[PDB]
From Swiss-Prot:
It is found in: Cell membrane; Cell projection, Cilium; Golgi apparatus. Belongs to the protein kinase superfamily. Tyr protein kinase family. CSF-1/PDGF receptor subfamily. This is Platelet-derived growth factor receptor alpha. Detected in platelets (at protein level). Widely expressed. Detected in brain, fibroblasts, smooth muscle, heart, and embryo. Expressed in primary and metastatic colon tumors and in normal colon tissue. N-glycosylated. Ubiquitinated, leading to its internalization and degradation. Changing Y19F: Abolishes interaction with SRC-family members and impairs internalization of the activated receptor. Residues 40-317 form the Protein kinase domain. Changing Y2C: In GISTPS; increased platelet-derived growth factor alpha-receptor activity; constitutively activated kinase. Changing N106K: In GIST sample; constitutively activated kinase. It comes from Homo sapiens (Human). Changing D205V: In a GIST sample; imatinib resistant, constitutively activated kinase. The modification Phosphotyrosine is found at Y19, Y21, Y212.
Length: 336
């Protein structure tokens, strides 16, 4: 049952109600990513799920800038079915198609012969944003109080996370890529407080995860899904924009649960159909809440694009933030 959530839209109708996803099986794989298993040392498990895990590792000779490099490694469980092994390959093709960006968890290499499949990816020291925000809750709170009366976590960090996710999603959307599970649990934080969007599905157990709900064959992240996804099974980049607003609510609640205290049941769905939206989280500014509400337009075409969101949020960031971000993004693309 493992497969990546992400899809690439091959073609879409003018209205946008019909589309075709690229079938990764159609694409050939070039082995530009192949890396000798002997150049990899594996360490401790970083996350473990129903059909695979992600492990910390060190790669020797994988990078020219960093001949000794800390990495993460994705791999299936021992029982894993052939179909899912193919899903790992598909993931390799999709990443190759996207190419690099500062704010996604990037592919670095792969071991696909003479052993189990390994996907070598960037290591994100701080883990996922939910856990990071929970652990730094009281530090943010303390900063807020000091600011009120006059190394941690600040409002500038929260706006930086907001911006970097918008930039990573603008990149995916620019590639006709739809994430379909955008949420704080799928945003990792690297050293330097660089946020990196991913699909951490391999390392979760979907059946026991209360962020997902059964429908039919699968488990869906209903509280992050746009109404046309919930009701009509449609997922486009504009659906992701809805998810992005839900993610912002998680960020500015410092890792709160969306629709807190509401269970996904018939009354939940009826409230959504009636136009219910979440209230402002405690630590959102009014501008930030305005951004969320725009993302939650019932009409997909009225939602802002990720380019427009990146532009809006840049207006909330000090001019020098943008200049550091652009330098770090440059440094990243020049690496190796």
């Amino acid at each position: 049952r493992y497969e990546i959530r992400w899809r690439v839209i091959e073609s879409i109708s003018p209205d946008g109600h019909e589309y075709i996803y690229v079938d990764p099986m159609q694409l050939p794989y070039d082995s530009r990513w192949e890396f000798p298993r002997d150049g990899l040392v594996l360490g401790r498990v970083l996350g473990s799920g129903a059909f695979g895990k992600v492990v910390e590792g060190t790669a020797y000779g994988l990078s020219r800038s960093q001949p000794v490099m800390k990495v993460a490694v994705k791999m299936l469980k021992p029982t894993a079915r052939s179909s899912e092994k193919q899903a790992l390959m598909s993931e390799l093709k999709i990443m190759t198609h996207l190419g690099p960006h500062l704010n996604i968890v990037n592919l670095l290499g792969a071991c696909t012969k003479s052993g189990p499949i390994y996907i070598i990816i960037e290591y994100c020291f701080y883990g996922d944003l939910v856990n990071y925000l929970h652990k730094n809750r009281d530090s943010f709170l303390s900063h807020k109080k000091k600011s009120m009366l006059d190394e941690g976590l600040t409002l500038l960090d929260l706006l930086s996370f907001t911006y970097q996710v918008a930039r990573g999603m603008e990149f995916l959307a620019s590639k006709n890529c739809v994430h379909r599970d955008l949420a704080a649990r799928n945003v990792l934080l690297a050293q330097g407080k660089i946020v990196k969007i991913c699909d951490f599905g391999l390392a979760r157990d979907i059946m026991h995860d209360s962020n997902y709900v059964s429908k039919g064959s699968t488990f869906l992240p209903v509280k992050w899904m746009a109404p046309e996804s919930i009701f009509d099974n449609l997922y486009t980049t504009l659906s992701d924009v809805w998810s992005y607003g839900i993610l912002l609510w998680e960020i500015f609640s410092l890792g709160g649960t969306p629709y807190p205290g509401m269970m996904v049941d018939s009354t939940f769905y009826n409230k959504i159909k009636s136009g219910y939206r979440m209230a402002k989280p405690d630590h959102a500014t009014s501008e930030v809440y305005e951004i969320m509400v725009k993302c939650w337009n019932s009409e997909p075409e009225k939602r802002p694009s990720f380019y427009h969101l990146s532009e809006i949020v840049e207006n909330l960031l000090p001019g020098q933030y943008k200049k550091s971000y652009e330098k770090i993004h440059l440094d990243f693309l020049k690496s190796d």
